[PDB]
RNA sequence: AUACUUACCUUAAGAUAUCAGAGGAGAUCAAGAAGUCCUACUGAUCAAACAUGCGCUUCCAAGAAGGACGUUAAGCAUUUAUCAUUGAACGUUCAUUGAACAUUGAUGCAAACUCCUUGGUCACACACACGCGGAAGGCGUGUUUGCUGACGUCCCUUGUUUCAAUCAUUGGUUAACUGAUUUUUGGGGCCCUUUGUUCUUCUGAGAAGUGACACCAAUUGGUGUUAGGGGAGCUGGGGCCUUUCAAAAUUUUGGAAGGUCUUGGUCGGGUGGAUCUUAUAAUUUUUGAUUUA
């Protein structure tokens, strides 16, 4: 997929990436992680869940693989029944764009606190 | 310990189940809540796409057509009209079959909204606490309304029409009332 | 194998690991030498110690 | 830490699905912070029936879910 | 305390969620009240057994540690829980 | 006394990992979490001779075309069954545990 | 519907009910780990077929610190067995000695007299020094002539324990090298305050 | 907004680099604890941010990547569409009684069309070998801090680009010439999906502003936006050159200063948050009941 994932990044740095998290069942969830926690409960935006069927599993044995996708959208997956997560797509907006966006979010937040201080007066 | 309510921008000094339930049912929370969710949707619908639109590089361009701009007052007016009309088209449903089956033997079990058994126990349970001061149900049978055209019902309502094309109707209907 | 460390959880470092199991379908017993291992105590059922 | 919200089901006939095919119907006499559940008049339903004595208590690990058979 | 995802599950109260269970059962219905321990209580529940049937519970209470995931509605994509920078209005004293 | 700290001394070291499933994983540790969520860049991972759930969990992780070559795999702690260290590494150096030493001086 | 009508109807407008078909996992009856578990007693042969044991050497590195701690404590106890024979201590009454410590270095002995003559006539005074540096260590031993002004010098309200001798607060005790039953100095695990 | 009443609730703990010395806490017993603790002390490693490089490495225009929760499509092949009891006829068929999605499906194999979203459809050039600014990662150097941040500059333009003419200023050469910059006029190209014909408002490009504007509910409450480019001043970093001083054997290294180029910017706290320890390896996510025996 030649995506070249950041060699020194873990979960909090992986935010808004498009993941391919894999579970104990062998089902795959694909989508933007928007949040995790201590127990690895993930949210997953626009998520699609794919299985292989039992029948297509025979072809998977030691190729074109009719994976079955249902569309779960905004789901919020659990840390108990997962196995492992990888990264599939990079996010939409680049590091400069994410950086300028975070600057604007912080300026707006400081401004809202100034407005709270004004209404408190 | 502290439960920050992101909508109310207030705190709960010590989290427990009962102050959470009583806060999330609280009318102040519901009002700021509804304002926020409406607000996010009207922002996302308002927010223009503004794609990059990577312009390619290209004889047969001989025809030239006139663009049509508008005045800034005219822009703001037609945008306001479109806002009101989107808000109508989303909200409006179609009555008809309520008004059609008005006299029916089992209208008052089926369309009267919580006598249906399926959604029925909801609307009793979804009723809000009525702490401030100030139904046609299953009892209705056939012999309640024996003969509907004795006691005059209103006619079937005349169908609705786009005002943009209201000028182009058949003038002078056959058969005056 | 010989044990290098202990855990509350019985996470165990093992050195010069012999491991050996049984493929039952007939049977081929397969063995593998793994010299430096870190084994989680969840899989560990029973620790027997020879004198 | 939080005790579960089975207060609405306090006397109403509930149906646990226990473990994946065990289905037990009783009346919810009790609950603790682990969803250990004390049922009265447990009557295990196989798809044949089997009654399960006067009182019973069922492990909140084994319990998957429970339905209110009685109206609320 | 909670952390972001179970706070989201505390947010999506009274709205149409869909749960898979570990058995493969995917309950679907309105979400009466979730707890912090992810025990979630649901209403007007339409259930899909592993065998492929469908039935209708009225009033289910599925335990948290057999939830496979839960799907909330789409709009909570845009939620103030996700805002990384919203500053705190002077915590109580 | 926990041994995850042992693994925390092992950033940029090349191990294999056998999972409770049966998946075998080859590729360096970039870090390790408190409860042993081990993140691993430059993986190629294999499944020895078979488990159908493991077959699905192998293929579906992209770049299968049964060695699957992946840039970056986070692995959850309760999936890691056993982890094979490099034999070049000296265990006498690592198990010394400066925290356990300080606690001996704390006593 | 829920409490407010507008966004519950329009905005949230949730997901389609979702398509189901056949799972891959096992439908509870067989979730098993491994009921066919090993029968270890065969392997008691194969360890003979396994046949030295490598040096642990890290527990040795901790055991060196533990053994050094016990050896230093034992050298302490050897200094504990090894104060009537001592020539610095004068064989006066222990009840008429007052100990002072936390003393400034440049404090002259005549000043020590001057702060101490207020209560009783002083018999003799030994301020303790290093024997190799000859810096004043910071503690001294006073015997008065009576016990009662040693006790009034021990009773401290407005006086000694808290007096600022050469711009520093000092500490003022009865001598416990002779008096109390179990006393060890700082070198011997004891000491006060 | 204020008052009154009711209901509910009021504190898990600790740490924030690590190791070794300098000094302190100048250690309450006859010269001394050992240890442990702190630090604008120093030294070493590590982590994070920022800057710079790497003649780093890879990816960037009818097609390529991804998707269709679309069709052709009942395309073709295969399979399946309850049990129990009783009666009758020769295991089957029919009838009665009792109990509990879908065949146009499902599964497999493809194949084609149509559609969708994204991307430097860049600059240069269109030719006979064996370029700058983008996006993602790796390494190196330097600074700063040992968690983070909260609480207690000016001017021009915003359709752009190119060409000619006029005028102003400045430099050089002998009033003439050449070059640079600014203004105006005109033409050509590209683009106007800028879909509301453009940071916000107003008018049909111009004008004003940088608390205001926009909008949904009932003056109040909520969310978003306040931009982009260029230049100058100043500041940070890197590279080169020159001078001086020191050290080592004309050369190397380090520091300072000046010039040129390139890139970037314009003390406290019962506060919270983040990370890591400890409760916490016992039913709810991390100390295993998902290799199906
Ligand atoms: Zn609130």
PDB file of C-alpha atoms (C1' of nucleotides) in Angstrom, chain H residues 100-253:
ATOM      1  C1'   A H 100     -41.729 -23.041  16.093  1.00  0.00           C
ATOM      2  C1'   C H 101     -36.818 -13.311   6.702  1.00  0.00           C
ATOM      3  C1'   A H 102     -36.263 -14.473   1.968  1.00  0.00           C
ATOM      4  C1'   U H 103     -36.366 -17.943  -4.502  1.00  0.00           C
ATOM      5  C1'   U H 104     -36.731 -12.978  -8.920  1.00  0.00           C
ATOM      6  C1'   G H 105     -33.194 -15.777  -3.019  1.00  0.00           C
ATOM      7  C1'   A H 106     -28.544 -18.205  -1.007  1.00  0.00           C
ATOM      8  C1'   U H 107     -23.425 -20.089  -2.711  1.00  0.00           C
ATOM      9  C1'   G H 108     -19.457 -20.328  -6.501  1.00  0.00           C
ATOM     10  C1'   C H 109     -17.137 -18.497 -11.090  1.00  0.00           C
ATOM     11  C1'   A H 110     -16.303 -14.416 -13.742  1.00  0.00           C
ATOM     12  C1'   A H 111     -16.932 -10.648 -17.495  1.00  0.00           C
ATOM     13  C1'   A H 112     -18.536  -6.002 -19.364  1.00  0.00           C
ATOM     14  C1'   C H 113     -20.715  -1.228 -19.297  1.00  0.00           C
ATOM     15  C1'   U H 114     -22.079   3.022 -16.636  1.00  0.00           C
ATOM     16  C1'   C H 115     -21.121   6.049 -12.431  1.00  0.00           C
ATOM     17  C1'   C H 116     -18.417   8.091  -8.196  1.00  0.00           C
ATOM     18  C1'   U H 117     -14.233  10.572  -5.146  1.00  0.00           C
ATOM     19  C1'   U H 118      -9.151  11.837  -5.086  1.00  0.00           C
ATOM     20  C1'   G H 119      -4.240  13.741  -7.876  1.00  0.00           C
ATOM     21  C1'   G H 120       1.681  19.283  -9.703  1.00  0.00           C
ATOM     22  C1'   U H 121      -3.465  17.093 -15.891  1.00  0.00           C
ATOM     23  C1'   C H 122       3.102  22.472 -12.305  1.00  0.00           C
ATOM     24  C1'   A H 123       7.953  24.749 -14.058  1.00  0.00           C
ATOM     25  C1'   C H 124      10.893  23.586 -18.080  1.00  0.00           C
ATOM     26  C1'   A H 125      11.486  21.518 -22.551  1.00  0.00           C
ATOM     27  C1'   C H 126       9.406  17.681 -27.343  1.00  0.00           C
ATOM     28  C1'   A H 127      14.900  16.306 -27.617  1.00  0.00           C
ATOM     29  C1'   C H 128      18.972   9.924 -29.215  1.00  0.00           C
ATOM     30  C1'   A H 129      20.676   7.948 -24.197  1.00  0.00           C
ATOM     31  C1'   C H 130      22.961   3.498 -21.342  1.00  0.00           C
ATOM     32  C1'   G H 131      14.596  22.844 -11.743  1.00  0.00           C
ATOM     33  C1'   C H 132      12.081  25.118  -7.700  1.00  0.00           C
ATOM     34  C1'   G H 133       8.481  25.245  -4.349  1.00  0.00           C
ATOM     35  C1'   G H 134       4.617  19.729  -2.851  1.00  0.00           C
ATOM     36  C1'   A H 135       3.259  15.129   0.300  1.00  0.00           C
ATOM     37  C1'   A H 136       5.120  10.855   3.444  1.00  0.00           C
ATOM     38  C1'   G H 137       9.032   8.464   6.103  1.00  0.00           C
ATOM     39  C1'   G H 138      14.742   7.575   7.727  1.00  0.00           C
ATOM     40  C1'   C H 139      19.389   9.729   9.325  1.00  0.00           C
ATOM     41  C1'   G H 140      22.615  13.743  11.022  1.00  0.00           C
ATOM     42  C1'   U H 141      23.601  18.568  13.458  1.00  0.00           C
ATOM     43  C1'   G H 142      22.196  22.608  16.647  1.00  0.00           C
ATOM     44  C1'   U H 143      18.974  25.171  20.265  1.00  0.00           C
ATOM     45  C1'   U H 144      15.478  24.780  24.253  1.00  0.00           C
ATOM     46  C1'   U H 145      12.758  22.012  28.006  1.00  0.00           C
ATOM     47  C1'   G H 146      12.435  17.825  31.230  1.00  0.00           C
ATOM     48  C1'   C H 147       5.135  16.779  30.163  1.00  0.00           C
ATOM     49  C1'   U H 148       1.697  20.213  27.846  1.00  0.00           C
ATOM     50  C1'   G H 149      -0.660  24.648  26.995  1.00  0.00           C
ATOM     51  C1'   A H 150      -4.559  27.138  29.404  1.00  0.00           C
ATOM     52  C1'   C H 151      -5.979  30.365  35.103  1.00  0.00           C
ATOM     53  C1'   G H 152      -4.002  34.277  38.422  1.00  0.00           C
ATOM     54  C1'   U H 153       4.570  45.670  13.420  1.00  0.00           C
ATOM     55  C1'   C H 154       3.731  48.529   8.836  1.00  0.00           C
ATOM     56  C1'   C H 155       2.348  48.880   3.633  1.00  0.00           C
ATOM     57  C1'   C H 156       0.241  46.961  -1.131  1.00  0.00           C
ATOM     58  C1'   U H 157      -2.943  43.455  -3.599  1.00  0.00           C
ATOM     59  C1'   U H 158      -6.697  39.439  -3.833  1.00  0.00           C
ATOM     60  C1'   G H 159      -8.583  37.529 -11.120  1.00  0.00           C
ATOM     61  C1'   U H 160      -3.656  36.217 -12.777  1.00  0.00           C
ATOM     62  C1'   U H 161       0.428  36.427 -16.357  1.00  0.00           C
ATOM     63  C1'   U H 162       3.128  38.539 -20.576  1.00  0.00           C
ATOM     64  C1'   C H 163       4.192  42.514 -24.437  1.00  0.00           C
ATOM     65  C1'   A H 164       4.389  47.936 -26.271  1.00  0.00           C
ATOM     66  C1'   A H 165       3.899  53.188 -25.371  1.00  0.00           C
ATOM     67  C1'   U H 166       4.152  57.622 -21.885  1.00  0.00           C
ATOM     68  C1'   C H 167       6.023  59.893 -17.303  1.00  0.00           C
ATOM     69  C1'   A H 168       8.884  60.021 -12.492  1.00  0.00           C
ATOM     70  C1'   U H 169      13.253  58.480  -9.622  1.00  0.00           C
ATOM     71  C1'   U H 170      18.209  56.052  -9.120  1.00  0.00           C
ATOM     72  C1'   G H 171      23.089  54.088 -11.180  1.00  0.00           C
ATOM     73  C1'   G H 172      26.888  53.834 -15.183  1.00  0.00           C
ATOM     74  C1'   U H 173      29.287  55.497 -19.847  1.00  0.00           C
ATOM     75  C1'   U H 174      30.331  59.664 -23.563  1.00  0.00           C
ATOM     76  C1'   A H 175      21.902  66.405 -23.719  1.00  0.00           C
ATOM     77  C1'   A H 176      22.055  61.051 -25.891  1.00  0.00           C
ATOM     78  C1'   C H 177      22.161  55.653 -24.497  1.00  0.00           C
ATOM     79  C1'   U H 178      21.463  51.135 -21.355  1.00  0.00           C
ATOM     80  C1'   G H 179      19.396  48.709 -16.780  1.00  0.00           C
ATOM     81  C1'   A H 180      16.094  48.556 -12.431  1.00  0.00           C
ATOM     82  C1'   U H 181      11.453  50.119  -9.838  1.00  0.00           C
ATOM     83  C1'   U H 182       6.591  52.582  -9.570  1.00  0.00           C
ATOM     84  C1'   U H 183       2.046  54.739 -12.021  1.00  0.00           C
ATOM     85  C1'   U H 184      -1.257  55.077 -16.304  1.00  0.00           C
ATOM     86  C1'   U H 185      -3.221  53.364 -21.067  1.00  0.00           C
ATOM     87  C1'   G H 186      -3.930  49.403 -24.624  1.00  0.00           C
ATOM     88  C1'   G H 187      -3.573  44.467 -26.719  1.00  0.00           C
ATOM     89  C1'   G H 188      -2.830  38.896 -26.366  1.00  0.00           C
ATOM     90  C1'   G H 189      -3.232  34.376 -23.533  1.00  0.00           C
ATOM     91  C1'   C H 190      -5.206  31.624 -19.339  1.00  0.00           C
ATOM     92  C1'   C H 191      -9.149  31.732 -15.862  1.00  0.00           C
ATOM     93  C1'   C H 192     -13.553  33.163 -13.784  1.00  0.00           C
ATOM     94  C1'   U H 193     -17.196  25.876 -10.867  1.00  0.00           C
ATOM     95  C1'   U H 194     -15.227  32.918  -7.859  1.00  0.00           C
ATOM     96  C1'   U H 195     -21.625  28.010  -9.207  1.00  0.00           C
ATOM     97  C1'   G H 196     -23.720  33.756  -3.885  1.00  0.00           C
ATOM     98  C1'   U H 197     -19.154  36.026 -10.219  1.00  0.00           C
ATOM     99  C1'   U H 198     -15.578  35.907  -4.748  1.00  0.00           C
ATOM    100  C1'   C H 199     -11.940  38.063   5.207  1.00  0.00           C
ATOM    101  C1'   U H 200     -16.926  40.326   6.410  1.00  0.00           C
ATOM    102  C1'   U H 201     -20.904  44.070   5.137  1.00  0.00           C
ATOM    103  C1'   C H 202     -23.053  47.260   1.317  1.00  0.00           C
ATOM    104  C1'   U H 203     -23.719  48.847  -4.204  1.00  0.00           C
ATOM    105  C1'   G H 204     -23.928  47.304  -9.856  1.00  0.00           C
ATOM    106  C1'   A H 205     -15.386  46.731 -10.047  1.00  0.00           C
ATOM    107  C1'   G H 206     -15.990  50.261  -6.245  1.00  0.00           C
ATOM    108  C1'   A H 207     -16.680  51.881  -0.987  1.00  0.00           C
ATOM    109  C1'   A H 208     -16.150  50.903   4.745  1.00  0.00           C
ATOM    110  C1'   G H 209     -14.105  47.796   8.823  1.00  0.00           C
ATOM    111  C1'   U H 210     -10.506  44.075  11.049  1.00  0.00           C
ATOM    112  C1'   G H 211     -15.396  43.846  18.751  1.00  0.00           C
ATOM    113  C1'   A H 212     -17.908  42.653  14.056  1.00  0.00           C
ATOM    114  C1'   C H 213     -20.616  39.429  10.747  1.00  0.00           C
ATOM    115  C1'   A H 214     -23.439  35.150   9.391  1.00  0.00           C
ATOM    116  C1'   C H 215     -27.440  32.041  11.236  1.00  0.00           C
ATOM    117  C1'   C H 216     -31.072  28.352  14.598  1.00  0.00           C
ATOM    118  C1'   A H 217     -34.264  28.334  18.918  1.00  0.00           C
ATOM    119  C1'   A H 218     -37.017  30.988  22.696  1.00  0.00           C
ATOM    120  C1'   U H 219     -33.280  40.893  24.119  1.00  0.00           C
ATOM    121  C1'   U H 220     -31.178  35.986  25.773  1.00  0.00           C
ATOM    122  C1'   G H 221     -28.633  31.212  24.610  1.00  0.00           C
ATOM    123  C1'   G H 222     -25.571  28.215  21.005  1.00  0.00           C
ATOM    124  C1'   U H 223     -21.822  27.339  16.712  1.00  0.00           C
ATOM    125  C1'   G H 224     -18.725  28.992  12.915  1.00  0.00           C
ATOM    126  C1'   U H 225     -15.716  32.816  10.396  1.00  0.00           C
ATOM    127  C1'   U H 226     -12.235  37.128  11.027  1.00  0.00           C
ATOM    128  C1'   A H 227      -8.415  34.844   5.537  1.00  0.00           C
ATOM    129  C1'   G H 228      -4.595  34.293   1.535  1.00  0.00           C
ATOM    130  C1'   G H 229      -0.196  36.296  -1.186  1.00  0.00           C
ATOM    131  C1'   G H 230       3.895  39.705  -1.656  1.00  0.00           C
ATOM    132  C1'   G H 231       7.631  43.340   0.278  1.00  0.00           C
ATOM    133  C1'   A H 232      10.147  46.050   4.121  1.00  0.00           C
ATOM    134  C1'   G H 233      11.808  46.644   9.429  1.00  0.00           C
ATOM    135  C1'   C H 234      13.337  43.376  13.333  1.00  0.00           C
ATOM    136  C1'   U H 235      14.497  38.508  15.070  1.00  0.00           C
ATOM    137  C1'   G H 236      15.949  32.849  14.768  1.00  0.00           C
ATOM    138  C1'   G H 237      18.671  29.030  11.871  1.00  0.00           C
ATOM    139  C1'   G H 238      21.942  27.211   7.919  1.00  0.00           C
ATOM    140  C1'   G H 239      25.807  27.933   3.854  1.00  0.00           C
ATOM    141  C1'   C H 240      29.932  30.799   1.768  1.00  0.00           C
ATOM    142  C1'   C H 241      33.812  34.604   1.999  1.00  0.00           C
ATOM    143  C1'   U H 242      37.128  38.164   4.638  1.00  0.00           C
ATOM    144  C1'   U H 243      39.688  39.877   9.204  1.00  0.00           C
ATOM    145  C1'   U H 244      41.543  39.068  14.216  1.00  0.00           C
ATOM    146  C1'   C H 245      42.788  35.912  18.599  1.00  0.00           C
ATOM    147  C1'   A H 246      43.970  31.048  20.861  1.00  0.00           C
ATOM    148  C1'   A H 247      45.696  25.787  20.444  1.00  0.00           C
ATOM    149  C1'   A H 248      48.169  21.668  17.649  1.00  0.00           C
ATOM    150  C1'   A H 249      51.731  19.849  13.808  1.00  0.00           C
ATOM    151  C1'   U H 250      51.654  26.549   5.433  1.00  0.00           C
ATOM    152  C1'   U H 251      47.262  23.492   7.258  1.00  0.00           C
ATOM    153  C1'   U H 252      43.304  22.000  10.838  1.00  0.00           C
ATOM    154  C1'   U H 253      39.921  23.338  14.998  1.00  0.00           C
TER     155        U H 253
END
